[PDB]
């Protein structure tokens, strides 16, 4: 569960900032500048989260983008 305050972040700042039918491509491109808008406390903790759940991470996002239940699916939040 150590992700699991960072993954919600993160998948927040895609549901607010990113359009809802974008691509995979376009989603893993916004993931990978993400983590440069959150708080500068968790930047290199959510460096380190995408970078171990990146795959799970596109495949659910392409379907939704909600913080809670993302978080929860890929394992992060438990």
Known sequence: GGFCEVCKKLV????????????????LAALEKG???????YQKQCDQFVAEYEPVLIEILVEVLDPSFVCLKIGACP
């Open 35 to 41: 983590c440069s808008f959150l708080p500068d406390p």
């Open 12 to 27: 927040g700042y895609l549901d607010r900032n990113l359009e809802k039918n974008s691509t995979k491509q376009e989603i």
